[PDB]
């Protein structure tokens, strides 16, 4: 009886309720943001999250993201920065994760992000060590803080436990905390505690997000190379493809 | 009786009340953000705003800014982007402007910003035309929208009316509106309507802010050139210096 | 295929999401408030609201109510007021109504209520004329305002349209409006507009609520007569019984 | 240099900022609520609170109250309840108390209240023992909980320390806590902790408030006796009169 898609009813209720929660928290959600790309399920085997529902507390990789801003910030740049513009830009989005669910392990080669918890608490799992890029020297300034070891008993999604292996550092973020930075090239993932009485709601402020999603299919590229560029590298293969399309029946 | 400074009492009450308002609106204001640099008065002649107070509705150039994030985002960048890093980075801050007061005319050579109104309404004045930079070619993608002509009867600060001359385009932003982008190299200014029952509260999400302020004096520079760099160019000279220091008695 | 109950999953998701929305809006929802009595479906034939779900926009009589306060306020009263205490007391609750759904036609003999819209907009239907009580004289002071006629095209629940007949006055309430009073002995009902992007969330502040609900079964009565007293009189019979118990499968 | 009044500027800034804070927290504050009666200073000697200001942390008895509802709830009552109506009714208001300031010791003969902390934390001081009323028997049901002893080092207003003597029970309330009931005939007072980074903001939901205030001078009485009735009994005489009028210069 393994689910392989989400019904139109389950999708709309999931996304509409989330938008309402976001609006209650004063996030500027416009109509075009509430679309068939907002609800993300990372892989066919993750649709089983809708067997018992988003309030079961079971570990699955699915989440909602409402993108209010994804600006290239290319205008006004000296032409010499053209090849480096993809590392800049401005992206603002509201992320909603239900109890026990995860934004799965992945890293970005160009995108650096920051987190601001609005509601609930955020458990971030990450590698304090950045990845390298064969043949190219990289700059360094602050690097990532080491953080703490994982707490006991973190239930991971079935069949994807090994994907969290390298994300050894842990940090629990709460509303009102200082902004937390996740530098590019660092593996990261996060979940909403399973016992949370509310969905985790976090605002991400980061550099440009290169994601050829369904709701993105059709946009114009500010610079040639950008077109089709996918700056997401999920440890789990099923996650990389799932990210770009949701199966709604 | 022209004021040339703000008393410790006026400053603390101004800044503390603003922080409380920000907290009520769920902005993550930490203790280090509530400092002697948060309250900005753009020039000695602007201290007269405290003759009748922040609720008089009189046109003066003063505002409060609580910076929660100003990340260089240099880590993980290929060394070749070093000279262009100053155009990137991530800056998040809450800006509070009282009735009739202004964030004065200025432009940034490197910083691109975006606005999200949280409380009240924001009246933005700007030049749809970007400035040029002698000897260097610049990229273009979306440019700035033209906007509308100024509404009738906008009271400008005394002795600084000519500084708003080139900012011919006008746009009134409200809570819930789409994010509004202010590209680098564009002159811009904004105020809270004089008849507003509440201070204007807006969240700015932009690229790195190069501002050698008092509360900034002492930070480490990620890249040599950055040290001491001031990416603010106010049309009014008194505004450029005032920005970097508040006179508290 | 007519539904006659709501599944445990549908109930929990409905109520849990609503509690989260309430919490986001700063309403003090404690654990004991999130129970099997919070989600109300007014009659077996109204369970069909869960055929297409709470976001279908279809007209059904169901709602969520989180009661934070229901205080008798009998302590300190002169004994002579004993027979009149049931008209006083203090009740505070958060009511959540989804698009197109209704809090059905009914009146209270003792309870006077007031409304404060927190999110969305509230459409109130009521009789400006109070009901009488055979054999007893009643006091008068302000009475109810007449209001406006119903707007065109209000979809009512199937088979219950006649129950709204006498509720001729209409008023649409919004967040920030003056408190709206619904005097006891006045027929009233309300819904969330079908095109609302968010569930209607309203805070009711009223006198004591005499409702022998399931989650109420077991409380102590401050005064003999109060025990078992049901101060709700729904025009629709199915509504009176449904109110006191939800069928969860 | 002892202050004996508050300047128009100090008053407006105090009240306007508070209204903005209330609005940010979604309390329905209308224009008529922002008047010359909202800011309360309990006695001529308490105006010294404005010597160093509302952010000094000094112990003074002053506060802001925005009343959104004060409904007699007399309509629909059987005539026999006329003499007991004054114990009922509905009153909703937002109370704002700055760091270290107090809502001074007092009790009500008819009014029962409840508290809901919206921002900050509330320290309530009260007598678990109700007062008696010569010649009249009173009802009892739940009475007041005993609470805890006062914490160490509570700074009381100068020259009014003895007024807090009988208020031996203490309870610290926070946002999200269960509603707290203060039965009529119980002495009570409260303050915002002196080290609070934000003003204390609390919503009071109670029975009718009989207060012949300045902004009240002119209202119609639903029942003869009510006219001019003052249901406030402050332990400090200067507090009883101060409550009804603010000296603005
Ligand atoms: O359109 C939006 C906001 O809905 C984003 O996807 C970006 O295009 C904003 O620049
Ligand atoms: O410290 C803060 C936030 O208070 C900012 O000034 C930046 O340093 C954050 O990166
Ligand atoms: O317990 C509560 C709040 O959850 C109400 O039902 C009343 O009992 C409060 O007095
Ligand atoms: O007018 C108001 C709300 O501003 C109160 O004083 C009461 O009159 C409401 O019934
Ligand atoms: O409007 C979309 C929807 O929620 O409305 C009815 C159906 O259930 C579908 O899922
Ligand atoms: O395409 C719009 C929409 O139907 O898609 C997802 C969301 O539910 C919204 O209602
Ligand atoms: O009141 C909530 C809000 O500010 O947040 C989003 C929605 O657009 C609305 O403007
Ligand atoms: O609204 C946010 C979003 O889901 O919509 C388009 C893009 O895919 C982004 O993830
Ligand atoms: O880490 C957060 C995030 O990058 O992960 C998935 C989605 O792209 C979102 O922006
Ligand atoms: O040291 C290399 C590595 O294994 O460590 C960190 C990064 O995730 C990369 O995979
Ligand atoms: O105990 C935590 C942990 O060791 O278990 C799985 C994950 O890889 C993480 O490193
Ligand atoms: O704490 C700072 C301050 O507000 O406290 C007292 C004095 O007025 C000064 O302005
Ligand atoms: O330096 C800290 C501080 O005194 O400076 C400004 C703000 O009022 C805060 O209290
Ligand atoms: O409740 C308001 C809040 O979320 O906003 C800022 C403060 O830190 C607090 O956490
Ligand atoms: O807290 C924000 C701020 O005022 O503090 C330091 C810097 O000057 C910035 O403008
Ligand atoms: O336009 C907004 C702003 O750039 O103007 C002044 C301050 O630097 C703030 O960040
Ligand atoms: O055309 C050049 C200019 O005058 O127009 C726009 C920019 O402000 C610059 O000053
Ligand atoms: O009327 C608006 C305006 O023309 O007046 C002053 C400012 O320069 C602006 O362009
Ligand atoms: O916890 C209750 C529940 O939501 O969890 C799993 C099952 O679906 C049930 O409805
Ligand atoms: O009885 C508690 C509960 O299961 O009942 C309704 C709500 O969903 C809550 O989880
Ligand atoms: O932050 C939201 C909140 O104030 O509202 C309800 C919950 O208890 C929490 O305290
Ligand atoms: O929590 C609110 C409530 O649903 O719980 C008990 C009572 O029935 C009331 O209606
Ligand atoms: O009119 C609102 C209400 O009285 O109707 C049903 C429930 O009792 C709620 O309190
Ligand atoms: O006049 C009597 C009546 O029909 O009118 C109002 C009330 O609802 C009652 O039913
Ligand atoms: O058109 C509105 C109306 O006449 O139609 C049904 C309901 O009785 C109401 O009075
Ligand atoms: O509008 C009232 C006021 O604030 O405006 C100017 C003067 O200071 C007075 O206090
Ligand atoms: O009378 C109205 C008013 O002036 O009185 C107090 C408040 O400041 C408001 O502005
Ligand atoms: O957005 C804040 C608000 O809801 O609270 C009071 C003001 O009227 C406004 O409607
Ligand atoms: O707005 C609330 C209030 O101050 O205004 C009138 C009455 O005095 C009450 O205390
Ligand atoms: O205890 C709160 C209160 O009764 O004390 C003063 C004012 O009357 C307010 O309503
Ligand atoms: O026992 C009588 C008394 O002293 O105790 C409680 C009440 O305050 C009254 O003053
Ligand atoms: O220590 C607390 C206390 O004993 O001191 C003063 C007040 O009367 C209170 O009872
Ligand atoms: Co990421
Ligand atoms: Co700027
Ligand atoms: Co009712
Ligand atoms: Co009181």
Per DSSP, the residues of B131-190 read: P--TT--B--SS-----BPPPS--PPPTT-GGGGTT--EEEEEETTSPPEEE-TT--EEE
Write down which chains contact chain C via at least 3 CB pairs under 8 A: A, D
Distance CA C191, CA C160 (A): 14
Q: Are strands D188-191 and D121-126 parallel, antiparallel or unpaired?
A: antiparallel
Q: Is D34 in the pocket of ligand 27 (CB under 6 A)?
A: yes
**DSSP bridge partners of B171:** B124
Burial bucket for residue D57 (CB in 10 Å: 0-12, 13-18, 19+):
middle
Neighbours of A126 (CB within 10 A): 24
Distance CA D66, CA D59 (A): 22
Burial bucket for residue B178 (CB in 10 Å: 0-12, 13-18, 19+):
middle
The vertex-D39 CA angle with D36 and D42, nearest 5°, equals 115
Kindly tell me the sign of the dihedral angle through the C-alpha atoms of B156, B160, B162, B168.
Answer: negative
User: Domain containing A69 — which CATH number?
Assistant: 2.60.120.10
Atom of ligand 28 nearest to the CA of B175: 1
**DSSP bridge partners of D96:** D64, D201
Q: Is D9 in the pocket of ligand 26 (CB under 6 A)?
A: yes
Q: Identify the CA nearest to C40 among candidates C249, C186, C248.
A: C248
Distance CA C223, CA A145 (A): 62
3-state secondary structure of A72: coil
Distance CA B16, CA D199 (A): 10
Distance CA B158, CA C37 (A): 63
**C5 CA distance to ligand 22 middle (Å):** 18
Query: To which residue do tokens 């016992």 refer?
Result: A195
Q: Which residues in chain D are contacts of B16 at CB distance < 8 A? A: 55, 197
Distance CA B49, CA B43 (A): 11
Q: Identify the CA nearest to B61 among candidates B37, B36, B97.
A: B97
Distance CA A244, CA A248 (A): 13
Q: Does D54 touch chain B (CB under 8 A)?
A: yes
Task: Name which of C70, C88, C92, C137 to mutate to probe chain D: the one with the most chain D Cβ atoms within 10 A of its Cβ.
Answer: C88
Which residues, at least 6 apart from D59, have a Cβ–Cβ distance to it below 8 Å?
A: D100, D101, D102, D155, D156, D157, D158, D191, D194
Distance CA A84, CA A74 (A): 10
Q: Identify the CA nearest to C34 among candidates C14, C15, C62, C6.
A: C15
Neighbours of C175 (CB within 10 A): 15
Residue contact D17–B17, C-beta within 8 A: yes
Would you say D114 and D124 are in contact if contact means Cβ atoms under 8 Å apart?
no
Q: Give the count of domains, chain D.
A: 1
Question: Which of residues 161 through 220 in chain A touch B, CB cutoff 8 A?
Answer: 175-179, 181, 183-186, 205-207
Q: Identify the CA nearest to B232 among candidates B50, B124, B91.
A: B91
Give the determination technique.
X-ray
Domain hosting B169: range is: 1-249
3-state secondary structure of B235: coil
Q: Identify the CA nearest to C109 among candidates C187, C184, C182.
A: C184
Would you say D128 and C75 are in contact if contact means Cβ atoms under 8 Å apart?
no
Relative orientation angle of helices C8-24 and A8-24, to the nearest 10 degrees: 20
Of residues B16, B54, B198, nearest to D23 (C-beta): B198
Smallest CA–CA distance, residue D120 to chain C, in Å, is: 13
Would you say C78 and D133 are in contact if contact means Cβ atoms under 8 Å apart?
yes
Q: Are strands B188-191 and B62-71 parallel, antiparallel or unpaired?
A: unpaired
DSSP A22-66: HHHTT----GGGSSTTSEEE-SGGGGGHHHH-TTS----BEEEEE
Residue contact D75–C143, C-beta within 8 A: yes
Smallest CA–CA distance, residue C47 to chain A, in Å, is: 16
| Residue D5 to residues B12, D48, D104, Cα–Cα distance (Å) | 22, 8, 18
Distance CA D241, CA D239 (A): 6
Kindly tell me the sign of the dihedral angle through the C-alpha atoms of A220, A225, A230, A231.
Answer: negative
DSSP E strand stretches across chain B: 39-41, 62-71, 90-97, 102-107, 113-119, 121-126, 169-174, 180-182, 188-191, 200-206, 233-234
Q: How many whole angstroms from its chain centre is CA D63?
A: 8
Task: Tell which phi-psi region holds residue A84, choosing left (phi > 0), alpha (psi between -120 and 50) or beta.
Answer: alpha
Distance CA A54, CA A62 (A): 9
Neighbours of D146 (CB within 10 A): 11
**D123 CA distance to ligand 18 middle (Å):** 53
Please state the φ and ψ torsions of residue A200, each to the nearest 5 degrees.
-80, 130
| Among protein residues, the one whose CA lies closest to atom 1 of ligand 10 | A131
Would you say D187 and D107 are in contact if contact means Cβ atoms under 8 Å apart?
yes
DSSP A107-176: E-SS--EEEEEEESEEEEEE-SSPP--TT--B--SS-----BPPPS--PPPTT-GGGGTT--EEEEEETT
Would you say D183 and D87 are in contact if contact means Cβ atoms under 8 Å apart?
no
Would you say B112 and B242 are in contact if contact means Cβ atoms under 8 Å apart?
no
What is the helix (H) or strand (E) element at residue D4, kind and residue range? none
Query: To which residue do tokens 């480096």 refer?
Result: A84
Q: Which residues in chain D are contacts of C75 at CB distance < 8 A? A: 112, 130, 138-143, 183-184
Which residues, at least 6 apart from B165, have a Cβ–Cβ distance to it below 8 Å?
A: none
Q: Does D55 touch chain B (CB under 8 A)?
A: yes
Smallest CA–CA distance, residue A59 to chain C, in Å, is: 17
Question: Side-chain half-sphere of D95: how many Cα atoms within 13 Å?
Answer: 25
DSSP E strand stretches across chain D: 39-41, 62-71, 90-97, 102-107, 113-119, 121-126, 169-174, 180-182, 188-191, 200-206, 233-234
Beta strands across the sheet bearing C113-119: C39-41, C62-71, C90-97, C200-206, C113-119, C180-182
Beta strands across the sheet bearing B113-119: B39-41, B62-71, B90-97, B200-206, B113-119, B180-182
The vertex-C197 CA angle with C194 and C202, nearest 5°, equals 80
Distance CA A121, CA A192 (A): 6
Atom of ligand 5 nearest to the CA of C52: 8
Would you say C242 and C42 are in contact if contact means Cβ atoms under 8 Å apart?
yes
Please state the φ and ψ torsions of residue D204, each to the nearest 5 degrees.
-105, 130
Q: Does D134 touch chain C (CB under 8 A)?
A: no
- The ligand that comes nearest to the alpha carbon of residue D12 is 27
* Residue of chain A whose Cα is closest to the Cα of B135: A78
- Output DSSP code: residue B78: B
Residue contact B21–D21, C-beta within 8 A: yes
Q: Which residues in chain A are contacts of B79 at CB distance < 8 A? A: 136-139
List, chain by chain if needed, residues with CB within 6 Å of any ligand 29 atom. Answer: D 33, 35, 37-38, 65-67, 213, 215-216
Query: To which residue do tokens 């890293």 refer?
Result: A107
Smallest CA–CA distance, residue D150 to chain B, in Å, is: 27
Of residues C75, C90, C177, nearest to D142 (C-beta): C75
Distance CA C140, CA C189 (A): 22
Q: Does A88 touch chain B (CB under 8 A)?
A: yes
Task: Tell which phi-psi region holds residue D13, choosing left (phi > 0), alpha (psi between -120 and 50) or beta.
Answer: alpha
List, chain by chain if needed, residues with CB within 6 Å of any ligand 2 atom. Answer: B 30, 32-33, 67-71
* Residue of chain D whose Cα is closest to the Cα of B8: D52
Neighbours of D186 (CB within 10 A): 23
Kindly tell me the sign of the dihedral angle through the C-alpha atoms of A20, A25, A28, A33.
Answer: negative
DSSP C162-227: GGGTT--EEEEEETTSPPEEE-TT--EEEEB-TT-SS-EEEEEEES------GGGTTPPPSSGGGT
Residue contact C114–D207, C-beta within 8 A: no
Please state the φ and ψ torsions of residue D173, each to the nearest 5 degrees.
-105, 145
Distance CA B34, CA B56 (A): 24
| Residue A131 to residues A111, A210, A226, D235, Cα–Cα distance (Å) | 13, 19, 22, 70
Q: Is C12 in the pocket of ligand 20 (CB under 6 A)?
A: yes
Distance CA D219, CA D41 (A): 23
């Amino acid at each position: 009886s393994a689910r392989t898609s989400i019904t139109r009813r389950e999708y709309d209720e999931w996304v509409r309720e989330a938008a309402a929660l976001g609006k209650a928290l004063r996030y500027p959600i416009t109509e075009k943001m509430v679309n068939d790309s907002a609800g993300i399920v990372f892989g066919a085997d993750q649709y089983d999250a809708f067997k018992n529902g988003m309030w079961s507390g079971e570990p699955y990789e699915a989440m909602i993201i409402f993108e209010s801003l994804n600006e290239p910030a290319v205008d006004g740049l000296p032409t010499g920065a053209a090849p480096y513009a993809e590392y800049s830009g401005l992206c603002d989005k509201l992320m909603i994760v239900h109890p026990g669910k995860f934004c799965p392990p992945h890293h970005h080669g160009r995108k650096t992000e920051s987190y601001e918890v609005v509601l609930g608490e955020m458990e971030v799992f990450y590698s304090p060590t950045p990845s390298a890029e064969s043949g190219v020297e990289l700059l360094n300034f602050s690097g990532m803080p080491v953080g703490s070891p994982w707490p006991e008993g973190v239930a991971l999604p079935k069949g994807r436990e090994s994907s969290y292996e390298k994300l050894t550092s842990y940090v629990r973020l709460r509303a009102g905390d200082p902004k937390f930075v996740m530098h590019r090239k660092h593996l990261h993932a996060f979940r909403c505690p399973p016992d949370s009485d509310v969905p985790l709601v976090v605002r991400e402020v980061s550099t440009y997000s290169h994601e050829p999603t369904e709701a993105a299919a059709g946009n114009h590229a500010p610079i040639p190379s950008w077109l089709g560029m996918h700056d997401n590298d999920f440890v789990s293969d099923a996650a990389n493809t799932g990210r770009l399309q949701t199966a709604i029946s």
